[PDB]
Amino acid sequence: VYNRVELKDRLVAINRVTKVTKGGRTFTFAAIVVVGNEDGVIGWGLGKAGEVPAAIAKGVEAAKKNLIRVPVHNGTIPHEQAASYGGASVFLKPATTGTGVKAGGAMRAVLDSVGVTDVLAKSKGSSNPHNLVKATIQALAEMRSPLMVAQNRGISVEKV
Amino acid sequence: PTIQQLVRKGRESFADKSKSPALNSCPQRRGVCVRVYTTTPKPNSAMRKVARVRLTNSKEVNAYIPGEGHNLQEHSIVLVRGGRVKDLPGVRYHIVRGTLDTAGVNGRTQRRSKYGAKRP
Amino acid sequence: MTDPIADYLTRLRNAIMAGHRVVSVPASNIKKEITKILFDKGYILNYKFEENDSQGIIKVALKYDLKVNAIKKLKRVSRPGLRKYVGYRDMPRVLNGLGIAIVSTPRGVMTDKEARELKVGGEVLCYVY
RNA sequence: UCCCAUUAGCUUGUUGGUGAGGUAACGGCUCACAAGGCGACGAUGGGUAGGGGAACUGAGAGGUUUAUCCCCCACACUG
RNA sequence: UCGCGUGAAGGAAGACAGUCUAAGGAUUGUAAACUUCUUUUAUACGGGAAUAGGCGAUACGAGUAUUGCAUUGAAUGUACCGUAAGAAACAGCAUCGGCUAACUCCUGCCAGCAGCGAUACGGAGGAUGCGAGCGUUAUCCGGAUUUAUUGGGUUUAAAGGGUGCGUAGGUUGUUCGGUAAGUCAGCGGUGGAGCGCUCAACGUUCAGCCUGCCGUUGAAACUGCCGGGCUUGAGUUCAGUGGCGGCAGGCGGAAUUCGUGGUGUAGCGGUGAAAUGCAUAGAUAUCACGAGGAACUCCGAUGCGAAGGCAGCUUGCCAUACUGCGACUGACACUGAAGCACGAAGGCGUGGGUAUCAAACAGGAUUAGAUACCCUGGUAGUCCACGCAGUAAACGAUGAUUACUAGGAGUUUGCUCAAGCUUCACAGCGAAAGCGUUAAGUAAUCCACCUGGGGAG
RNA sequence: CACUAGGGUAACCGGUGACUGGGGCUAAGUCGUAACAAGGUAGCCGUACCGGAAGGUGCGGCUGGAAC
Ligand SMILES: [K+]
Ligand SMILES: [K+]
Ligand SMILES: [K+]
Ligand SMILES: [K+]
Ligand SMILES: [Mg+2]
Ligand SMILES: [Mg+2]
């Protein structure tokens, strides 16, 4: 995964995460954030702070710190790709130019942050936000451009 | 399983049961009020009005009476539809208000069509 | 052995996973054809055939970048338990045209591109990309 | 071209041959030697359905159901 | 199901409702003042659906004129006055979801879920959907991959048969030729753009699939079949090395039980403490002789067997494994539904035997009770032979076969090498614990099994 | 020859019956404490015998057990 170290922020989900102590229950606040510039660079992070704005800010900082470069062309994907992370599995396929993003939720947030316009996306695992976004970014990272495939194989006129 | 195992045996698909089996794939049935009594919910502690009714399809069931104030009594012809009550074991049917012997709720000004009350 | 072609694909895949540079195989005619197809399509560095007292040996030197192999996935399609036959009008595209499918045809053993050019179908041996 | 092996053997004109009769017509269709035929690729027995194109509905795989319409089959209180 | 109407443009913050004595929402909403009539009503004109005697002449076809003919029906449509005049409901507003003040109740109630019993119940005011409809119930599909060929799984969530042998069936190392069953190809037969509805649903026409079935010609890479080959898989032979592998016959010492006799006398035994029990008509202990039954200390943690299992010594008869040969045959292979065989302990039947231990049973203790745990007795059983029975946490909770993929620490045998035997541990796998060359990694073949929990094996 | 009608034995599909036994859910009134910690006698599987009841004991097996 090429790290490639302005991107807008998208809040995927927040969680009311608790703790048990003899005195009582102490509550934290977690948040998954994805940063992207709709260009081919997307990062994700997890903020774990007390207040909701503090958690969102920490997640934004973590997502900005951890960024990768996703090879894209126009607004579609070069080929179909399936990837599983944890209890979640994702499948992405290219679609027609006048189709838009056909998926909702964490998949929609990740694909909007990466800027892909036309894509057919389906989730076959669980609806966990962490594993879902991680599987989607893994699927995007394992994606090879036609130029990259040509460079790895040799000649660039292999498709003929 | 292997391809030959599937060829020899195949796959078996079950049938989903119907949530209202006493209706016999009908929207509503007609019955007579065999008994009219009151039951206690399974953390609610109310007094829910129910009627044991013998339907014309040769079946006896328990039907809840929604609303406040029922003019029904024993040996009354009622219209019974589907729909169960969560906090009451047993009963799984409702009695339509404003049909046959059952009368509409008096003094109702909202949700009138669900309790058979005309426009005032 | 049950599926020698699947065994050949598995040997190649295991060598790629282990990051070896060469891999040896007990030779066969259809496997000689498959490795020739792979070499002319640009997935391995080179090959060599050694005709010994046995059926023979195939030695394949794989292709690595300046440390990623040129081959990403090998998938056997027509297994003995379920044979797959297709025509030229219904032949499949592997990795949306960026990968190949080795196909045995009455005109010989070639890829899906050459098979669709020659208008002939047959057995789909494997998907390679 | 539906389920049941908590349905394993079934059939005695049943399988074939000769001859005759009968039929619009071939034929155990019927009437006067050899013995067979059919079954774990499900005979036989039991339960339930009229069958298709349509129609509805799934990216596809398909599936559901014959409400109107069209084609075939069966029937006209019961034999 | 489709289409239309219930009016169109201006008119400041009336009266009456709410929420706060004024302000905000209803609200440009009403009231008047200016036009239009789709539509309703009254009148008139009113289509379309209706097309079907001579003059060639082949003497008859056939081509040309005329005649009446509408159930729908004042029905489309067209036109004329005088008028906004005749025409809007239903659901839900705490989250999922679009939409919030006040009064009730504090049971009555409501719910698809988180549930509230109120930004959830009932009303009043406003809000939000849809709209001649709006909701409730019933039925069927998709999301559901909740039967998974495309497209799931079985160590611990449901899920590997107790283990083998094997029938039908499924699968088939390498190579040289034939054939054409599967497969592939060709040729035949068959089965979106307009137009009209004033628009639309809807009618109607052509471009467009026939990609299902059948016939007829060709191709030979792969599967199948036929005819030969090869030795690497498989098997046979030979040599070496084994072994708590099976069956059967003999031989043993320690401990312990009983009977009969020497010595000897105030207790022994048991428990947390005791007691029930044995013992001066002679115990425990101790020395002998006689008669028996059961189990095999040290080695001893490792090895063998398909599994269950197998341990004193020795012999006989069997089986089997591992390694190699320059010996042989030539794919003879894998798996395996039915069936068959074996299968711990406990249990059953007949005949033996019967020392220890010991269900049931009896007594003594502890407890509120003790139908138990502790103690003392004690019969089946535990042992042998033959025959039934067919179960287990029969477990590595992990089926068999084949090929491939990293390192460390030990160990046994055959000699640094190859078999086997167990724990840390790359890639990879997994939900995680973890597995990791003896995989739970990468792949192929066949079998067994799972589809929410009880009911219920 | 067979449509029926008649007797009789045999099936299958069904009702009812003096009396006699499981299961589910709601109450929880009573009686004990079996399991979860070494749950106060480690637990569980098979089998046999015996108890108001959960259970107890004997024989073999397992760790899905402590503790040494
Ligand atoms: K480990
Ligand atoms: K207890
Ligand atoms: K205990
Ligand atoms: K065992
Ligand atoms: Mg389990
Ligand atoms: Mg096993």
Residues lying close to strand F (Cβ under 7 A), chosen from 89-118 of chain B, are: 89
The token duo for A26 is 């102490």
Cβ-proximal residues to B19 (8 Å cutoff; 6+ apart), any chain = B82, B84, B92
The resolution, in angstroms to one decimal, equals 3.0
The number of residues in chain A equals 160
Query: In angstroms, how far is E287 C1' from A133 CA?
Result: 93
Q: Which nucleotides of F are covered by protein (CB under 7 A)?
A: 25-27
CA triplet C70, A70, C21: central angle to 5 degrees? Answer: 15
How near does any CA of chain A get to the CA of C60, in Å?
16
Residues lying close to strand F (Cβ under 7 A), chosen from 47-86 of chain B, are: none
Is the four-CA dihedral A150, A154, A157, A160 of positive or negative sign? Answer: negative
Nucleic acid strand E within 7 Å of B106 CB: no
Helix (H) or strand (E) segment spanning residue A36:
strand A29-36
Distance CA B81, CA A81 (A): 50
Under 8 Å between Cβ of B31 and B62: no
The token duo for A48 is 């774990």
Helix (H) or strand (E) segment spanning residue A130:
helix A129-141
Technique used to solve these coordinates: cryo-EM
Does C106 contact chain B (CB < 8 Å)?
no
Burial class (CB in 10 A: 0-12, 13-18, 19+), C77: buried
